[model samples]
Target: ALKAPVVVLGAGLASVSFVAELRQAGYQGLITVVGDEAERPYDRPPLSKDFMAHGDAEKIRLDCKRAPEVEWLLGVTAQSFDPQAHTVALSDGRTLPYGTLVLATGAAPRALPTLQGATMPVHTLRTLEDARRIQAGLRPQSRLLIVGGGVIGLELAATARTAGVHVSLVERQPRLMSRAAPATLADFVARYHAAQGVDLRFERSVTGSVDGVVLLDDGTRIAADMVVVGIGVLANDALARAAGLACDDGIFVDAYGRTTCPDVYALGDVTRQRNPLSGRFERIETWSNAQNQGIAVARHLVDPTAPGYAELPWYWSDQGALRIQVAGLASGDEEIVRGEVSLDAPKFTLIELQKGRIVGATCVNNARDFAPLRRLLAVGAKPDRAALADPATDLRKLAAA
Candidate 1:
């Protein structure tokens, strides 16, 4: 039964990682991967960071280090999935039959409706092509107006600013990464970007554009050489929805990465799965999720007795010279601050606790503490606030208490 054909939709990290795990699990089944992009599945995290800066495609390639046996059907879009028949129709007039199907169709960048019809092209980053296009436009002092202060927006702004592009970020919300980051972390980011010469406009909206000029909600017009919109993402679950899979903005999956149908599964950014902490179905779009969840699901399928995927969801971002790493959910009533998180010296550790146990953490350029801090959170450590916050106390010593 394991020797049968298994076709995966989308060739992103999740699908690629799944294939890797299948091969590692000693399954020599006929594996097929279909993707719309011509390029092989590459690490997307660098597209906004190093790729935009260096333009070296090879550097960002994910080194599985072990080549999985797969029939990689590049440049083919999955048109439809026939679950009952176990067949997937391709845009190139090919129908793929599979004993098992994996839905790794990822999310697309949310677009700004006003900028959509602007004379000057508005860019959204999700693919290699988008990265290249954005990079090419970032000449010295190229005015890049970015709408949305999400992770991608901040990352792109930092990269473009480093390339000497005039950057201005407009967030419709009151702060940066409002949904993703805590107010403490968000305030730090706002200050960091502002100090680095970003025209930070909060509580703002891009009404439209005309002749390379961006019109804001407040009648403020700014000339922009290029515009990028990174509001967030809408799950590419249209196919999954059409197939009658339970979806609400995302495809619902269990902790085991199993969709409503046992034979079908979804993972990575495309999935809205159970968060062990929140006890809510959430779309975890972090690079860590794509790697860990994909691998776990693949292994679980090969051997069901394997432990359920219960690892804490974490994500990291590099904005300017700062590295922001967060473990667990970034929400809790009481937040404890460690180290110098002041606006001047931004290196610090901020952790949130609930009922005398660590639930989440936000680390800013304080990697030395992240390892231990995250471990404490993972184990639900209830260290004294003084010990947790005191710089004199070594966080490494704190653990599953």
Candidate 2:
């Protein structure tokens, strides 16, 4: 009788989803969730967008009721785990014996080493507490300097600008979203943000912070009340690493979410698994990955013969009025734009084709075609170029065809 509880080392979406799905799949085993945060599981995307504009923690709370009969060890971090002994040591001076363990500790925002000892408040958006601190610091007519042109920085720029705060964004890259979005999408986003009164600086890095003024590489100094760094995140794999689990930037996991260690699984942003389309191992750090990966792992636990988890990586970002969604890889040989894309009306889909095959697609204020494009990419379908670019042509039909 294997009665030891299934111990999960996170209280975020992935851990909650796993526990929920396990219970939904009729698993009667005892489950314990350990989270460092005191707050319950909540959605993170809103923390940068809507939550920044409006401070409402309850609005983004994830439903945990679905995962019934689970013990929650909130405000306590998992110190270490002995894989051989099947036990996990917690920060609260308690050790838990587990039959199965899941590492869903997720990721932490990377801090700028330059701004480590700044006198002003420098924040990173990752947890609810971080979001709250950032939101509290953002006041109307206050000058806010954002470091990074990625999703978090751009989205926060939009929110703060809308709230009457003067926003200035600095990116080391020449363009916004240089890592994720194609040139077409990046240009559009840059233009949109510029038109909205955001001081967008390209090819600039923070050199120093002196006397409430941020110094740039070019010797430009901008005085700001506070700074928010959203450069990137580092995977939370220290626990697994100490346990001798294979890890690079993230814990190595198979499609079934099984880590290198037996009976020890990993989910969410912490797992480096293969991307079905790219055939490269990547740490998918989106809400879709966290939710679906957890479900996939739970399904596999229930039925080992089930299909492996290989959903196409995708992400959606709502920056003020603009809604952007991208699926699969961003770079491709040929880029196709469908429908009109103007400053006033940004309703279009940018399809990335590599070797005449649909590899990726990015939609701006166009949600109708996002699903169809995702389906086409999933099946590796190559539709006619003329139809793909036609605004009047039905994408659903092309996907079916």
Candidate 3:
């Protein structure tokens, strides 16, 4: 029996990674990738960091040239999918029949409803086009208002500040990175950004925008030549939900990337897989997960006996001069500091423990401790508090111990 072509929706890092892995596994089959964006796959992280300064698209472009015998359908989107028919309807009036379907449609940045019809140059950073628009608006000495204190918002704030643009960032929460970072780590970020000349506002929400000004809930107004909303993202699961797949803002998937329907799968930021660390279904939205999970799924398809994808969740954020890396869940009953993490000295590692077992770790401008700390979290290593706190203690030794 002949196999149908593998049809993948969304031409992104996950989809390209899947194609590359599938081919690398020596599979001789047809693979078709559908992407709505006109440009080929590109890295997203630099859109707020390097791309702002350099404005180079070629540098951030993902390498999909290695994957052979793959058909790319760019500038076209999958309109709908008929599971029973085993076909995907495309926006270009083409129907694609597939033996297997993969959804890597990814997520879209959450928008501010209050600024829906604002006349100002309001932006949200997600794609190359979005970043370019924001970059064009960030002229030197221009006033830039950022609405959010998350990774994207903070990164853009740093980039803007480096460009000599005045930045005022607003966050509804009292602390930065509140969702995943410990209070102490958030404090470090707060002080670090303030030292870099960022106008940080907490416990404030955008009420509306009018006449080149944004109103806050507290009756305060901020003047801005341009605005960027770096709020969170929502999964692009409309296609999956239309096909009747299980979705809770994301498509549900197993370790093998299997969805509720047979011959159907979802990967990357669009998937809500069971997080081994959290013991709950959560979306892993990081560059590492997108790349590695795609490879794992493709390998599993080539060999069913392959181990399940059980990598611990981790992410990193580059804000100004600080590089924050966090592995595993950041929350725990107990917390420990390895060194001084302050505005003056921002190099340290914060370890989190749950019931006396190492559960998570955060590194701030301390790259040497990151790998070993992640290893300790993976192995559930509980080093002595004094040793963990000592800056001279070798984390590798801790992991080995």
Per-model CA lDDT versus the true structure: 0.86, 0.90, 0.90
* Weakest 10 consecutive residues of candidate 2 by summed lDDT: 1-10
TM-scores for all candidates: the values are 0.96, 0.98, 0.97
Residue 236, model 1: lDDT of 90
Better lDDT candidate (1, 3): 3
Query: Candidate 3 clashing pairs?
Result: none
For 161-256, candidate 1 gives per-residue lDDT tens digits of: 899999999999998988757788998889889989999998989898889899999999988888988999989998889988999888998877
User: What is the Å distance of residue 38 in model 1 from its true position?
Assistant: 0.3
Those runs of model 1 whose alpha carbons end farther than 4 Å from true positions after fitting are: 1-3, 64-67, 343-345
Residues 1-401, candidate 2, lDDT per residue (tens digit)? 12347999999999999999999988888999999999877989989887777788889999999899999999998999999999999898999999989999999989998898899888898988998888888889999999999988889999999989999999999999877678888888999999999999999999989889999999889899999999998899999999999999899999888888898999999988898887888887899999999999988887778787878889999887799999988988898988777898788899999989999999988898999999999988888888888777999888777
Model 3's alpha-carbon lDDT is: 0.90
lDDT measured at residue 146 in model 2 versus the true structure, 0 to 100: 96
